[model samples]
Target: GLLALGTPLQWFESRTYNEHIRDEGIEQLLYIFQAAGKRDNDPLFWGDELEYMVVDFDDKERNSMLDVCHDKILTELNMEDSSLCEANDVSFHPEYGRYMLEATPASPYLNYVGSYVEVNMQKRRAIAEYKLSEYARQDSKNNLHVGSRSVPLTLTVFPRMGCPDFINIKDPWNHKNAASRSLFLPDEVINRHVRFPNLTASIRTRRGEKVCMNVPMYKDIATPETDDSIYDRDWFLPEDKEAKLASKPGFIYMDSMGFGMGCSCLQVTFQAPNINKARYLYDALVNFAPIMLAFSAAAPAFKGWLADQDVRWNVISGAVDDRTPKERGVAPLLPKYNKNGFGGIAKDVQDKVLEIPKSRYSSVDLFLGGSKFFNRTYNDTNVPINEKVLGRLLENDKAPLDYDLAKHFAHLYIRDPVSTFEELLNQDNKTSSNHFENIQSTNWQTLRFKPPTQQATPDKKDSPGWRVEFRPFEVQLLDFENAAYSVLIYLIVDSILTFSDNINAYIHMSKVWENMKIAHHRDAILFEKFHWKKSFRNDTDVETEDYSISEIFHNPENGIFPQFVTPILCQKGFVTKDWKELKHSSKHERLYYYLKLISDRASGELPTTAKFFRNFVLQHPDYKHDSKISKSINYDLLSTCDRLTHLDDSKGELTSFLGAEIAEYVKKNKPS
Candidate 1:
């Protein structure tokens, strides 16, 4: 039912109208925290969720755009037996946008020390494409389009998004309370599943206006001047005051949740061995969040124009902002939600002002897990925790809310729940956790800490376990590249645990935030310097140094983290310092090679996907040095990607990081 689109209309209306529902939700969270501190020592089981775009290429017109045909594809996929699909170890889920689909493993893939990393990802991609091909074959027979064909792609953002005359489905019902009122996206382009549209509409309504997004446009040599006339007249409705106020000179304006939720991403969830280890990984990974995002940077353009930004973080952050006028500091604060009696408007203004440092979906604020490098004093500082709430939860549960853990959850609950359900309200605090999830799920942080919970089917062996989700990577065009990035993280996590006592991975949250901004700079992987710990030893505690993105991960002069790669090699008994020997030795060598390839890309010794794509665009004979990407260019780019996806040997052009043997590797390792 949660995945379907048929919830009663009254249910949604009641949830929105009732203020007391939030009051009950807080109690539900308290109950959840009562048992939250407990640890589960399950063997690590993890899975990857890859979001993809289904596009239609108009060969006649030389245009490639996102095809709003997910409804048709999904319906046909479901009409067949799911058991057969599950047997292939892949399953599909509907994403927020009609053109997007999420492919995940049918069951959680066991993490066998990262051995099956490539094959599992390869399997998922194979099945996902198979399902898409089935739909395309059927569609081709039924409707002979004007020399157009369907293609499912793994790109991060659709290049033509928000452009005029781009494809957008018409709303089937054309309701006045549509999910998105964007000039480019239609309500029907949103998934028909009730929860998706409801969340979009509710987030918009609570903010009292449409979401506002402004991304700096890329200024090429022949780039045109900022043209206000481009968005004037017909584009602006009388009520689009927010869009007008938000769109700025020197920026590409976007004003819908679809722009953010519609974008594809690659995410991974890991089951921790214990609660402490989970927290440790969470803290350690926060330090690398910005670096990894820069490493996997893909989306360089949006709205058919090249953008100054290289990643999708800030764009999505602004697309889902639900702050009210007072919260956004446009108006003075009022004491409506406070339990304590308001003295006057002045007192309320001083006490209730909400100063948000960044968007809800931005980098993490506090590191919760304990480590020698992250001492108690350092962890206690620079975190915003509501001690009042922490004291209440700890009073009854006897669960310790150590400063870092308390602050993490306290900061999460600061925002009001964006989407609530009438059926979930007044839930039993001790038995039901919907109210807790209602608020937690809406706070889309970069790193999410999910506590262990009871399974719906209530199986002892398969209960949900404590886990952390890495939420930054953009889906790569080639499955091997995506798998390489995914496995690199697992190795990093393994290294974090392996040398927990020997290394220092903690950096100040402020520095992390600074690095996150630099991570979006054009050519960041080649030119930007990120803040990283200079020393790995615990005695040097909290000290950091700025390292160029290329130098930090693999520099031979003073590189500290190369041991992350070295240790993994030793674990498999390779134990060699020679790069040549490790490049072609065995299975372990192949894994090491992928890691080295990523390292080389990080140091700018090799090109990243973003760099390669940018070069492709710049070198195209038809490009006029303007930021605008023409239809022919887009078609060429997609065509190149289609060939790469099928492992076509294009040679000399667009070199494969996985090498010439990738085809042989896939043929031999293809899942049975």
Candidate 2:
């Protein structure tokens, strides 16, 4: 949602105070390390953040538009069903787009998976559904065409998002809009909060221009290779080279941050018992980012054009890139002296400004674990970091900064805080992590190593502890699919912890980037190989090797993931547990269903979600082999997607897409 409310600063205003921000941010970190770093034996609690888009289906107009009613729905939810200290299981929050809503458990699921999490996942989905319909039913006289037709879906990206007339509201994009001068998305679509607009403006101002994303277009027989769409801008000179060149032929151009941040995603956060396990999971789970990304690939189209890339990882990365020309290595970065700077920042280091690479929104730069769990060789990426912060922290004996975790925070300090509050200029660092959080939160890595919030006093036993957020999983089409993804990840993490030193998951950081690049390619799940540890045992000195998704999960010569793991196997040793009652089994096959779902897709028995979505459009009757998603086609796709949200497995509806167990949880829960 909106950040802690205060005067939101623009880039120029925030830049002058960047030194002070980093200094106080460090002070806060040191305070946190002393206060909550050593506290132990906190029970494990984890939850998933599911981002959703409300789509309004209009049969009369034959259009499926993004419903801009999140405010009403969210307000109603808080008023209708919010729990007290012992209350509400689901919580609703706003996102980058007005159409998007981010829902999570009010607190977190307390150390249980299979049944508990999925039941609440359905409740989360249904609560929003109930609110959306209730608001419509109560307000038809108020001109809301959103009835039962307006519903939430766990779509990664709306197919026709940023295309012409895609929002339910009638306003079209204006080139003159203040926040983002997007050609395709009106400022109306962005959240009305001052922080979001300031964030958009700050990124643009720091980057020297709008961030550009080019997803290669999916080629079909009738698709045109010539560039004709981006030339109609108000400022277009026939010779405006950058504007023209930005929209490359055979690529879908996205110029706004909203196109990236507007999309939804699935993220699971684990509240580790202590700082050590938090660091371990942070480094261990790094390799799974792209693997899970590939398996969970869902959005293959954007701006109404089908794209060659299937996932939202790269799109979001570029959307918030705030690097200057100097930092991006386009020119020499000369150091600028400031009073608050770390002048002990060596003479040779200050000789030239350090050229920073990559966005604050991309992968983790350092493995944050201790010596036993992380190797120096694994952090092979020459991450351009803020030397001043590193030097300052190193000199400050209270908080040692020589380690990789310190370097990781120093790297995050490279970017200026794009959005900050006026209240931060003189706030005490002891009670709040605003400065620290302002920087850390923006560094949206695949896995976030979060220090516990100081919202509570250290003397309190109920305060939060260290946490790790797994951020690469894509939001899928069904709640059951989301539950499956959730269960799969938790099981893997539990196995890693249960087996201790036997479950090593670190690979070279550069290859992590390699796998990230490979994962976005269409159908990378079935077709590509990812760099992984050859053996899970810490005693083995074997180097990393590439493995296909199938081989990674189920190596024929030796079992790799599911069945061999103790928790999964102890729950059921057999791959298919309910052996005699296989096809028509009444028992849910909880262990078998979640693992087999991944195995089935990896083994090529089932299609990755993106492939299913891609084929749906490709095989549509009105498609005519064109790459463009027409209005009718958009409606049909999203409408079909909306229907699947409330499915009936008894009639064998969506029997091809879902397992029988997928309906069992929903049939039982049904959102009471």
In terms of TM-score, which candidate is strongest? 2
Runs in model 1 lying further than 4 Å from the true structure: 1-36, 75-79, 113-115, 144-146, 168-177, 227-230, 233-238, 331-353, 376-388, 398-400, 454-461, 556-561, 574-581, 656-672
lDDT of each: 0.67, 0.73
Query: Residue by residue across 1-672, what tens digits does model 2's lDDT show?
Result: 223567987776677777788889988887777678676776677888999888888877779888875566655555545542125477777788888888887777766455667777777877777777677776776765633278788899889977877887665643356677777777777877678888998887666556778888898888878433565555422112344645677888888898889888999988776788888878888888888888789889988888888999898998997765555656212223211122222223244445667888998888886737567788888798877778766677565655777787888888777888887687688888888988888999899998886553346556778888999998987777788788777867666555655566667889988999998988888878888777666553536778888887776332246323434445543324432222333443554555567678877778767887888889889897869898999988887786666774544545556546544544554322
Which pairs clash inside model 2?
Answer: 83-87, 83-88
Model 1 has an lDDT value of 0.67
Alpha-carbon lDDT of model 2 = 0.73
* CA deviation > 4 Å runs, candidate 2: 1-3, 79-88, 146-148, 173-175, 235-241, 331-353, 371-373, 455-459, 540-542, 556-588, 648-653, 659-672
Pairs clashing within candidate 1: 550-603
TM-score of each: 0.88, 0.90
Q: Compared with the true structure, what per-residue lDDT tens digits does model 1 show for residues 33-62? A: 455545455667777888888877777777
